[PDB]
Amino acid sequence: ANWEHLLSLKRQGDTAKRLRIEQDDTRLGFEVDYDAIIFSAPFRSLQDKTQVIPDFVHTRLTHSLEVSVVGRSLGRMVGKKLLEKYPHLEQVYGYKFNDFGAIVAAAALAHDIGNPPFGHSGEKAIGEFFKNGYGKRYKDSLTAKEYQDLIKFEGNANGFKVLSQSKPGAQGGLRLSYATLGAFMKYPKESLPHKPSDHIADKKYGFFQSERALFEDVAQELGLLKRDVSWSRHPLAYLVEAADDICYTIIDFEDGINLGLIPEEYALEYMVKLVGQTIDRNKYNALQETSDRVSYLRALAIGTLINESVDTFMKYEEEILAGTFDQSLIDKSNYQAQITDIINLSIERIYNSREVIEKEIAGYEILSTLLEARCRALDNNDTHYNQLIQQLLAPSLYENLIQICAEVSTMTDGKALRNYKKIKGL
Amino acid sequence: ANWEHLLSLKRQGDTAKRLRIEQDDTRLGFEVDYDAIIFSAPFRSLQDKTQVIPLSKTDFVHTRLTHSLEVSVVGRSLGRMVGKKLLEKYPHLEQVYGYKFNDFGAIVAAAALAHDIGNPPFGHSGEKAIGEFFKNGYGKRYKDSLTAKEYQDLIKFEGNANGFKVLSQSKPGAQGGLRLSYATLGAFMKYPKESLPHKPSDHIADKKYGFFQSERALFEDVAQELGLLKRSTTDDVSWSRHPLAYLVEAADDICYTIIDFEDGINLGLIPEEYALEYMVKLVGQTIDRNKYNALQETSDRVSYLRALAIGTLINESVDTFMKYEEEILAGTFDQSLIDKSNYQAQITDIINLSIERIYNSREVIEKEIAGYEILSTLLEARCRALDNNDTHYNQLIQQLLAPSLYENLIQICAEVSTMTDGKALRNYKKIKGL
Ligand SMILES: [Mn+2]
Ligand SMILES: [Mn+2]
């Protein structure tokens, strides 16, 4: 793989090559990508979507904003070192270290843009609707991969659809740079085969059958290595994933302490190695509020993990470029012991808290209900009832079903509740 | 002081003495007292009243009823064990007069069952809402038409004193209220004094007062029959506590100390990580740690800890009572039984943890703030209606809430205090349009 091709400024439908040395740096293609996401309706809808808990708790937007800030640091630092490793990238082709930060930042900002309401239970509720719910009727009218798209409905693949979806008057969706689309794709494979290896890149899939032709174009332009289609990941996708990993590990922990779900004493206990070399003890002892102490620990822990993740990337750079790196960056951390205890305590005290369990069980019913109304109106567009269902909710069979799943996933948590209540009369 | 008189079976209005030796043991006056409380409307209303944590439907929280049940079971056990040792010390009590050890358990059980029956809703904010209403609120108006003690009853309104009123209030067709035995009324009365003088000492019996001016004549009859020792020779009357009142108090101390902690752990207000650190001295010699470690639910681990600690404190309290029995009988004991505990420091640590994690939790603070407005509102509407009973709105307030000036104000306070948490909030909500 060549870094010159991985940093493609191509946008969908382009008929001519876009050279980095010819860009107006006030309107750098990569930085425009960030701006286009910020102003888009799917990104705005993350305002009203839940990260884990439904006081102050992170939403998907605040989470995605934090991931994109950590991603920008990761990208800037790795970029600076990539340019010194391969000076021809700057001296011949005109790349600057802020381009790498721009690509990671925009990819990170978009990384959860396709996730449904109710988080990852929402994804499972949609897949369950097709595996065992009303949606099972379509199994024999779908290909294996079309049906696998639905029963393993994947927010990452839905995000790729959201970003690139064509409609009349808007070909190519947000029309992001191919480099940014590359850095977004952390599972560059279709739904089948299911987990062909133990690599994190094979854990899920990254695009629906409906988007396969589009990612084939992205991968061709980027020069991704071929690995049923799948490719070795764009190197920058490891930094997006690292940023995301860092944020939800540390920030969910912080949230759980401030919510009273995790006793505060665990904070220093699990984070002391992560902050020991950089913490100002006099500052820490002077801070009077739990929230101020835990936010200080979090800033230090995140900075420690950013630095290590940059070093892990550079150490394994050629292995990532050859598609032979077998782990995530955070899997290689020296703090893996502490990261594990943090995640396990978060799972115990937050993810399995009664209120989270209750919301996730309720979301199953809410999404199963909205999906069944949509599919029934699709099957019988004739009855009076199904004509009203269409005015209320939606004013090839595979393409109809994948669009039904996509539209349900654009719904905020609140809006999913209201439309569900009306269908049931509440 | 004499135990024969302290164990009086007299009921209010008795024209002839009731000898213990002539009682039917299947209808023992002290055990009839317990049953009369169980079936009384005031005790039933405790079912719908918060003890400390606001009630919910998502979790079990102790109500005033469940708390009072637990205190009477702990008190019955204290009275039984203290009774047997008292009958062994004064065997004339059984061999001549016919007292049995279960008599003492019955007196303490009944007084304990009733000990919180007069408390206003929403906790001690309820009491201070009532007090401040007459100190500086609308109630200030009446100060000059009231004696210093009548007024003190209002500005320092006390649920213990309202409990005594509740238990003995005379109404048409029902003179003497529940008509409990004087022994039970003596065990109930932990502050045997009027509202003034205010805290004349550091003794726990002088921290508050135990009866309103409207009940003074009744408690004078009670203290005379029991032979309680005088603690004042002025026109401000006061008496040494009935010895069994020390056992009611200890049962109460034991239950809210250990059981508030238990509730705080089960509700997640106190981290479970603290359970063994705070209980280890109370349970260390009797706990079966293998059994504790085999229990798989938090609520089971903490109920095991609670039952061990309560057992520990019951035995110790029985021993403390008997070691200080003559001082208590002479009215010279100056503290509570629990104050003398060898676990005093651990009890204090548990109580402070509960204050920090439960009483200062947001929900308990929110409730006390809400209570202050709900009760102040109800008191304002009752008292305005009392002053101008002619207006149409005040006739409605009378129909909604209540279908001598002091006797009216003390009755309004008693009626507001015996409202359940829900009825008070509903009436508040309607007075304010919701
Ligand atoms: Mn994320
Ligand atoms: Mn009590």
Short mmCIF file of N, CA and C in Angstrom, two decimals, chain A residues 263 265-266 349 354, chain B residues 58-59 271 273-274:
data_model
loop_
_atom_site.label_atom_id
_atom_site.label_comp_id
_atom_site.label_asym_id
_atom_site.label_seq_id
_atom_site.Cartn_x
_atom_site.Cartn_y
_atom_site.Cartn_z
N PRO A 263 -18.38 3.69 43.18
CA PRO A 263 -17.77 4.48 44.26
C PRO A 263 -16.47 5.13 43.79
N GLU A 265 -13.68 5.86 45.03
CA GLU A 265 -12.38 5.28 45.40
C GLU A 265 -11.80 4.41 44.30
N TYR A 266 -12.65 3.78 43.48
CA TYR A 266 -12.13 2.97 42.39
C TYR A 266 -11.35 3.80 41.37
N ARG A 349 -21.38 -2.25 36.72
CA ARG A 349 -22.11 -1.24 37.48
C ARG A 349 -22.93 -0.31 36.62
N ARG A 354 -29.83 -1.52 36.67
CA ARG A 354 -31.23 -1.82 36.39
C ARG A 354 -31.80 -0.89 35.33
N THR B 58 -40.45 1.10 42.80
CA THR B 58 -39.30 0.39 42.20
C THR B 58 -38.54 -0.38 43.29
N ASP B 59 -38.65 0.06 44.55
CA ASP B 59 -37.88 -0.61 45.64
C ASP B 59 -38.64 -0.66 46.97
N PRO B 271 -22.44 2.32 49.66
CA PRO B 271 -21.77 1.22 48.96
C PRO B 271 -21.70 -0.03 49.82
N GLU B 273 -19.53 -2.16 49.80
CA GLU B 273 -18.15 -2.31 50.24
C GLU B 273 -17.96 -1.90 51.70
N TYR B 274 -18.83 -1.04 52.25
CA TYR B 274 -18.72 -0.55 53.62
C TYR B 274 -19.42 -1.44 54.64
#
